[model samples]
Target: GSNMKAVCVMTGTAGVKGVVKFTQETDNGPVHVHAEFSGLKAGKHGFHVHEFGDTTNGCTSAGAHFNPTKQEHGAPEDSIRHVGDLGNVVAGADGNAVYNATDKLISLNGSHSIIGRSMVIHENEDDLGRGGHELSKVTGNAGGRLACGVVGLAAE
Candidate 1:
């Protein structure tokens, strides 16, 4: 298959900032993710691919996570989680963060394509559905949207 690539430049009002890079060189392997961020609250942050790329209201209009399949909120490695359940990104005491990982559910084409979606960083930590809260199975009880960026095509 052909190679695909994308990126999201994270932005927000005050607490969070970053740019995330996505690359997929193989037809059937995971998408490699690399991120650099700053201004977080020095804790774990919920990072996810949301349903829309719309920026009509900053980070508020992105809707929920990009769940092409109906499923509960769970960890990235969980079998019953949404496709966009990317888990979390942790920031340092300096309010900066860097993340590198590989994910299998994010696609650049076909039904699961995330090219027009958005990636969000939350104000609080993502419990990965183990928070034991009412919103756990749905939103991971992650509080407040700190920053978000739309996914767009990158050099392939």
Candidate 2:
């Protein structure tokens, strides 16, 4: 078996801050993600890995969701969903959030690797393509990105 890891230091307007950890025990194993955040309003926010690591235009330049499979927007549990869609993170009344999720779609190495990409936290909840809203099928109706960070190789 092999080990791989990566990290993302997230930031956004108005002091939003977070650090996310990604790890995979083996090449064919699931990618485990651990995310922690602060300075956000008390609510669930969309969490995903955007296509590019380019934050040149803030979060917008990161481009759309990382959907190498060209699937519709959906939850982390969905069979047909964007690889970037890791679901949502909910903040407490004190403006902090911690989340952990595991997935096979997002990887540390492979045809659909996540290295050099960007992870984004949005302003609204992700409807998981069931919102019937205009952007639901593509963006889960999740609004503007709050905080984002580029994925960097961390460990072996």
Candidate 3:
């Protein structure tokens, strides 16, 4: 029953480079997050909304997915996927990523809001439609932890 505005941004690491921006709104209904990223390393990387906003130790501080429902890790298109799973980001030769999507399973007005969470960037790509393989079970095809940032409300 509330409307909140949020923004997210980040810088890359040794194997990654980019900046991400997100606009989130909450109104007791479905939560929506509009995101765009640029300056990446020209490849696909695993992008996800993590459980904590603590990037204190770089990407590792972000913890895991913000899965309050205890859902398993899966692709965004999977029915059993965690709500924080946003799939992968494909960076072109110019290292840019443009993303637009929404999730109604989570909210921003109260306890369900993803504010104060973390967004992570992996060093590799995400398969999105596979399982059990070496590249599928643990972290899709996405490689090492490349970069990450905290998500929060923007200045008024």
lDDT of each: 0.87, 0.90, 0.68
TM-score for each of the candidates: 0.95, 0.96, 0.81
Q: For model 2, what is the alpha-carbon lDDT of residue 111?
A: 66
Question: Best candidate per lDDT, number?
Answer: 2
Q: Candidate 2 on 33-93: residue-level lDDT in tens? A: 9999999889889999999998776688999999999999999999989999998999999
Residue ranges of candidate 3 with Cα displaced over 4 Å: 15-26, 134-138
Runs of candidate 1 with Cα error greater than 4 angstroms are 1-3
Output the better candidate (1/2) by TM-score.
2
lDDT of 2 at 119: 94
lDDT of 3 by residue, 16-126 (tens): 545455444437665555555665677777888788888776677777677777766778767876767778887779777776666665556566677788778777777
Query: What's the CA error at residue 140 for candidate 3, in Å?
Result: 2.8
What's the best-to-worst order under TM-score?
A: 2, 1, 3
Candidate 2 clash total? 0
The local distance difference test score of model 1 is 0.87
TM match of model 2 to true structure: 0.96
Predicted structure 3: lDDT: 0.68
